[PDB]
Design a protein around this ligand. Structure first.
Ligand SMILES: Cc1cc2nc3c(=O)[nH]c(=O)nc-3n(C[C@H](O)[C@H](O)[C@H](O)COP(=O)(O)O)c2cc1C
Ligand code: SF4
Ligand code: SF4
Ligand code: SF4
Ligand code: SF4
Ligand code: FES
Ligand code: FES
Ligand SMILES: [Zn+2]
Lengths: 263, 106, 426, 87, 80, 24, 83, 14, 210
């Protein structure tokens, strides 16, 4: 009961009614390339980098969004769903400022990888790029937001996980900038999580600005002692001094988030 | 040319060095810019592959023409940022000419 | 074959000439069988539109009856609603500005006739804020109607209850979109939603809702009065009924005439409206449904006629049926270029493919008008165009791609020459 | 894209069955890689027998041993994977 | 957000001294088994490696994200 | 056309709490 | 002392290496060299910064000199641009 | 009038 | 899209709905469904614009206050729509339609004339603060293409000197006959009324049976 049968490139998994197309691929084990979709954040559909092709259907569907229906076989590695990613990645990269050797989310980029695995070998954007104006969101998060792919996960977290409801989108067109309209710092606990949740390195951590680069960091899994929730955390150490502490997921205690104090 | 050192500590010169020779640790300079506090090429460890020349985005680290740097003591061969920057200033004129000649090829 | 009779013509008050107010409306006899119709049943009203086979009078074409049928499902304890979008941001849609301004009442009874068909508790009319004066006209008309008791609880001396409201638009073409009209009504930013939670299922304020082009709501009372058949006959096959046609640009007498559908394109400029300015051979191209639909060049046009089936055969859309005509005296490369400028100044930016893609085509299109870009770039824009066409959250990205596709499809040699012209002078 | 010659993929596959039939004992999982390369896999006891058949069979003379190596998959119960490449 | 590095089990030896080097300030380590992390496909096989090699082991159960119900329609609910 | 000494350039990394010079 | 300031205190051992020898330090300390660089005035809202010489410069970035309040500084050259 | 639509609105509201 | 507090445009500018305005504000609230203050912000923001064209940061904060919504929520609405002005607006605020339909029928023509008459660039207020010119997009009413909406004047079908005539009317006196200043009524074939030149059928005409 309550087990629709849906096909993932044929594996024919059975899933609860109401699971998204992206979720159906996960249980088979396939990963839809995704931006703007975080498990504990509301589905928004902003990036549409997850377009897949349900069989016998005219258009490709939004994985994170379409509730999978009965007997729709998902074709995640079709000739179409790759042109639906080879052509989106064309766009995200087109307005992107190539300062990857500045972006300290160098190896921690969910946008170079997906470009480097699912995107395109070369660029055709012979036109000019855009630039936004760096502002102050506080003393912990450095928002070099010319990096932003307008994926609205910050505006969600800042409203849904934390109740700040401050960060918001401002304007329309290609100069929609997701920054506080008036310059009011994002002061709240749970603040630093925005860093971890922005896949782009637009806003990153200001103390850990340029002290390291992720491939080097040796990662040891340990426990938060600053507060009594005992949140799980990963201490990233390079050559013997701790460089950053970032959350590691514990369903029951800290589910992917850690306090501003303990990082 | 202005006088600001080219390296911006992306540290992939460290990543691609085959011998583990280059050691880089960085911190934001007061200017707010990104610079390397310590850049140490261990020349005895280095096998002069020339990939670092290849990898650098700003092309700050280059394989300079001089081959005559034999040293009496092992410590002299280990090179910190000041020796390399000084090496860079001394040979910049020829390095610029050499890069000028070969950049179209690369 | 068009040439609809005046008596058959729906909005007799078109062009004014009759009091748009109630007493003019009574001489029009717009409120003649309203009590009877509602009495017949909601099921009777939808039978009338199903028999009519009316297609959406807005840019998208879908059976009107089936769309209304969807939220005719039993209420789940949330009040069902009616949303009438009087916004018409698309260029050449002065189509709606008429009914709203000239014949506000027709739409008022369209609202309650339509309301009982969907069992809507109330209807909100989103007239574009640009039209402030237009708003002044409708609520004067809405105020008259309630004073009469035509609308309100126990509307038209019947069990059924309806309340009609007017909402201020704020200069956004996208507000027009079905999921985005709602969000503007909801008071959040005008950004469309995804279709998986369909509009009927999740409504405004989470209450089932339905959205209709004002023309679609307006004709429903008269179609019930005249019966689906009368209306059904004028149309062609799936296509059916008279839809207002607006002809603007390079025509001797630009005007909106509600002449019959399935009109030869050559005929409507030649017979009504004004023959193409400069002669029917001075026609570089025709935009049949407005900016969103691809333009069709002259040789294809007279052959084809204005009905949605015929146009989709032609690769173009009937859309809002706004005919924009371009004489041989126009730089199309620049004409379509401003429509892409029309879309960069307007798309919400919620979705990646439209945000960067429409801006990317705008930059390439501006270079194309100058001729700075090389010839190989022209098919590059082809490929950028279809990336935007199938990947966008709403249809506007669908709409931005089509004019670009039309320019490359029929006017590829001209753009190459502009390419050539700049290369020669160096 | 490499210039694959299906002509090979087939002929080597056919030999792989040939060997599999000739030595049903000691030989399992015979497969021709997508690289036009055959890799008969044998039970350790078949080391002597399978090699000898290949060194001295008219329809399969494999005279020289190019290499003997042992990958180590620690996860695998049998840690080492002695691989003998013959020409 | 990629999960391709959370698939195979790994067993890692305990961390040891990393004193600073006086001449150049480079990190220096006296523990040979430090950088060694062996990768094992299943928990059972990794436990076996520790037992036959004689190293002490303390296995940590895999913790995989719990299924989470999501639906675009749900947040559009003004009610909640 | 017409003896170095190597050293760590990075500074201290862990600062020692200095004892209070005020006797108690 | 040097760009970073690496220095050895009197009590500091590890300073003997210089006894009767010399230390490697830099004149032309870069920290001050770009500060010595004039602010590149521009007309456009946004400007590029190839670093000078294209392939022989830095990956080109576009800086938003949109607020006179701040002279955009390409993260690579440290060049301030005065709107 | 700037407020005529709005004044009509509470005329509608009663 | 960033409000850098300025002495003129910043909350020191106190904002409060006139006793009369506040009245209006609620009228809006009950029009919208019960318990949904948020829907009323775009209309309430519009009346703040009706009150004052500038609508500074102070005014938006009041809107959020009256409507009890996250302030940002109001800031996002104001930024998204062009109807709202977050900067001071000229008394007349003329807007010229320059989409292809109007351009094809000469919309651009009008622009050059208006720039000279106002003697100012396109996009800013006259020194007199008298008029503000902006190149707005399709304002509807295309059949009449030459067009310039001045605070809903929606003058349409305007020849160059016409506007000059209108502008003068605005410059000295008021209410310059807003509307299409050409013989045609509303939208009508310039030739006449081919659609319906007969008299309109009366009530219950040919009403189908059933
Ligand atoms: C960008 C965009 C703008 C639109 N604008 C309008 C509009 O101004 N008026 C309108 O009736 N439909 C508009 N539509 C179509 C609506 O999405 C919807 O299909 C239509 O309003 C439904 O009315 P109907 O079903 O009665 O035709 C627009 C669609 C898009 C993608
Ligand atoms: S985000 Fe930082 S790292 Fe990822 S691509 Fe953009 S710049 Fe390079
Ligand atoms: S900031 Fe990071 S998260 Fe917020 S939108 Fe830009 S990218 Fe998405
Ligand atoms: S040297 Fe070139 S590569 Fe190595 S860090 Fe400095 S800049 Fe990056
Ligand atoms: S397409 Fe994407 S961006 Fe353009 S309007 Fe529809 S949603 Fe907003
Ligand atoms: S990941 Fe598919 S919608 Fe953002
Ligand atoms: S484009 Fe000017 S009003 Fe339609
Ligand atoms: Zn630079």
């Amino acid at each position: 009961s309550n087990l629709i049968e849906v096909f993932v490139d044929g594996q024919s998994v059975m899933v609860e009614p109401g699971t998204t197309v992206l979720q159906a691929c996960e249980k088979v084990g396939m990963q839809i390339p995704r931006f703007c979709y975080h498990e504990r954040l509301s589905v928004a559909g902003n990036c549409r980098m997850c377009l897949v092709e349900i069989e016998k259907a005219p258009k490709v569907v939004a994985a994170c969004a379409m509730p999978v229906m009965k007997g729709w076989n998902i074709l995640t590695n079709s000739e179409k769903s790759k042109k639906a990613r080879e052509g989106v990645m064309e766009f995200l990269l087109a307005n992107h400022p190539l300062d990857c050797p500045i972006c300290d989310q160098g190896g921690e980029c969910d946008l170079q990888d997906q470009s480097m695995m699912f995107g395109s070998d070369r660029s055709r954007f012979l036109e000019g790029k855009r630039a936004v104006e760096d502002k102050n969101i506080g003393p912990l998060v450095k928002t070099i937001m010319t990096r932003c792919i307008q994926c609205t996960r910050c505006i969600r977290f800042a409203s849904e996980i934390a109740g700040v409801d401050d960060l918001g989108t401002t304007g329309r067109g290609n100069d929609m900038q997701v920054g506080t309209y008036i310059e009011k710092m994002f002061m709240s606990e749970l603040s630093g999580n925005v860093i971890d949740i922005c896949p782009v390195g637009a806003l990153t951590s200001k103390p850990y600005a340029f002290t390291a680069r992720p491939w080097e960091t040796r990662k040891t899994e340990s426990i938060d002692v600053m507060d009594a929730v005992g949140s799980n955390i990963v201490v990233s150490t390079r050559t013997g001094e701790v460089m950053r502490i970032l959350p590691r997921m514990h369903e029951d205690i800290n589910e992917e988030w850690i306090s501003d104090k303990t990082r | 040319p202005s006088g600001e050192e080219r390296c911006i500590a992306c540290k992939l010169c460290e990543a691609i060095c085959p011998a583990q020779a280059i050691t880089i640790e960085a911190e934001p300079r007061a200017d707010g810019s990104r610079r390397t506090t310590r850049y140490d090429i261990d020349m005895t460890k280095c096998i002069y592959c020339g990939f670092c020349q290849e990898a650098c985005p700003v092309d700050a680290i280059v394989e300079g023409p001089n081959f005559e740097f034999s040293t009496e003591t092992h410590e002299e061969l280990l090179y910190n940022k000041e020796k390399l920057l000084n090496n860079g200033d001394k040979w910049e004129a020829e390095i610029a000419a050499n890069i000028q000649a070969d950049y179209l090829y690369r | 074959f068009g040439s609809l009779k005046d008596e058959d013509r729906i909005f007799t008050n078109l062009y004014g000439r009759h009091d748009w107010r109630l007493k003019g409306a009574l001489r029009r006899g717009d409120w003649y069988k309203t009590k009877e119709i509602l009495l017949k049943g909601p099921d009777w009203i939808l039978g009338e539109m199903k028999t009519s086979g009316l297609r959406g009078r807005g840019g998208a074409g879908f059976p009107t009856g089936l769309k209304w049928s969807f939220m005719n499902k039993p209420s789940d304890g949330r009040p069902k609603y009616l949303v009438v979008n009087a916004d018409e941001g698309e260029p050449g849609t002065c189509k709606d500005r008429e009914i709203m301004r000239h014949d506000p009442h027709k739409l008022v009874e369209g609202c309650l006739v339509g309301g009982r068909a969907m069992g809507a508790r109330a209807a909100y009319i989103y007239i574009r804020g640009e039209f402030y004066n237009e708003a002044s006209n409708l609520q004067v008309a809405i105020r008259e109607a309630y004073e009469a008791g035509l609308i309100g609880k126990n509307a038209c001396g019947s069990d059924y209850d309806f309340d009609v409201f007017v909402v201020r638009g704020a200069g956004a073409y996208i507000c027009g979109e079905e999921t985005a009209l709602i969000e503007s009504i909801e008071g959040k930013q005008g950004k469309p939603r995804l279709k998986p939670p369909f509009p009927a299922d999740v409504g405004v304020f989470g209450c089932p809702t339905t959205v209709a082009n004002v023309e679609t709501v307006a004709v429903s009372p008269t179609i019930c009065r005249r019966g689906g058949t009368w209306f059904a006959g004028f149309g062609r096959e799936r296509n059916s009924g008279t839809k207002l046609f607006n002809i603007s640009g390079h025509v001797n007498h630009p005007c909106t005439v509600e002449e019959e559908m399935s009109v030869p394109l050559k005929e409507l400029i030649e017979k009504h409206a004004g023959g193409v300015t400069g002669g029917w051979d001075n026609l570089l191209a025709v935009i049949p449904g407005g900016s969103s639909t691809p333009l069709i060049p002259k040789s294809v046009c007279e052959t084809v006629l204005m009905d949605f089936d015929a146009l989709v055969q032609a690769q173009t859309g009937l859309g809002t049926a706004a005919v924009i005509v371009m004489d041989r005296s126009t730089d199309i490369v620049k004409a379509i270029a401003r429509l892409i400028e029309f879309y960069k100044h307007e798309s919400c930016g919620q979705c990646t493919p439209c945000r960067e893609g429409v801006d990317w085509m705008n930059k390439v299109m501006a270079r194309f008008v100058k001729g700075d870009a090389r010839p190989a770039e022209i098919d590059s824009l082809w490929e950028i165009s279809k990336q935007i066409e199938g990947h966008t959250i709403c249809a506007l990205g669908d709409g931005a791609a089509w004019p670009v596709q039309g320019l490359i499809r029929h006017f590829r040699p001209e753009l190459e020459d502009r390419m050539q012209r700049f290369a020669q002078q160096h | 894209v490499r210039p694959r010659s299906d002509v090979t993929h087939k002929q080597l596959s056919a030999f792989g069955e040939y060997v599999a039939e000739i030595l049903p004992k000691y030989v399992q999982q015979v497969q021709v890689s997508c690289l036009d390369e055959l890799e008969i896999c044998i039970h350790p006891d078949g080391v002597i027998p399978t090699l000898t058949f290949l060194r001295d069979h008219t329809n399969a003379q494999f005279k020289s041993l190019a290499d003997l190596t042992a990958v180590d998959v620690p996860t695998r119960q049998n840690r080492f994977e002695i691989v003998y490449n013959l020409l | 957000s990629g999960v391709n590095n959370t698939k195979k089990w790994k067993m890692e030896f305990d961390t040891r001294e990393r004193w600073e080097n006086p001449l150049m300030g480079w990190a220096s380590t006296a523990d040979p088994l430090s950088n060694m992390v062996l990768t094992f496909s299943a928990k059972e096989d990794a436990i076996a490696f520790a037992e036959k090699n004689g190293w002490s082991y303390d296995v940590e159960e895999k913790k995989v994200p719990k299924p989470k119900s999501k639906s675009y329609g749900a947040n559009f609910s003004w009610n909640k | 056309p017409t003896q170095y000494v190597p050293y760590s350039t990075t500074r201290k990394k862990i600062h020692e709490w200095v004892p209070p010079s005020t006797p108690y | 002392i040097t760009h970073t300031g690496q220095v050895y205190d009197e009590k500091d051992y590890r300073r003997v290496r210089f006894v009767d020898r010399q230390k490697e330090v830099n004149e032309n300390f870069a920290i001050d060299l770009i500060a010595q660089q004039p602010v590149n005035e521009v007309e456009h809202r946004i400007i590029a910064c190839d670093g000078g010489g294209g392939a022989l410069g830095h990956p080109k970035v576009y800086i938003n000199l949109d607020k006179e309040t701040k002279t955009g500084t390409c993260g690579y050259c440290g060049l301030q641009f005065k709107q | 009038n700037t407020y005529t639509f709005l004044d009509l609105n509470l005329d509608l509201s009663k | 899209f960033v409000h850098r507090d300025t002495p003129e445009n910043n909350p020191d500018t106190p904002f409060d709905f006139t006793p009369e305005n506040y009245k209006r504000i609620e009228a809006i609230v009950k029009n919208y469904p019960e318990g949904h203050q948020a829907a009323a912000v775009l209309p309430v923001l519009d009346l703040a614009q009706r009150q004052n064209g500038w609508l500074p940061i102070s005014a938006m904060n009041k809107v959020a206050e009256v409507l009890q919504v996250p302030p940002m929520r109001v800031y996002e609405v104001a930024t998204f729509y062009t109807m709202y002005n977050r900067k001071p607006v000229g008394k007349y605020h003329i807007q010229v339609c320059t989409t292809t339909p109007c351009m094809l029928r000469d919309s651009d023509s009008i622009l050059e004339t208006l720039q000279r008459k106002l003697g100012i660039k396109v996009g800013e207020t006259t020194p007199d603060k008298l008029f503000t010119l902006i190149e707005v997009e399709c304002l509807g009413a295309c059949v009449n293409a030459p067009m310039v909406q001045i605070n809903d004047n929606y003058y349409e079908d305007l020849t160059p000197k016409d506007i000059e005539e209108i502008i003068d009317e605005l410059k000295a006196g008021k209410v310059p006959k807003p509307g299409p200043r050409s013989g045609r009524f509303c939208c009508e074939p310039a030739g006449g009324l081919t659609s319906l030149t007969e008299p309109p059928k009366g009530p219950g005409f040919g009403v189908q049976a059933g």
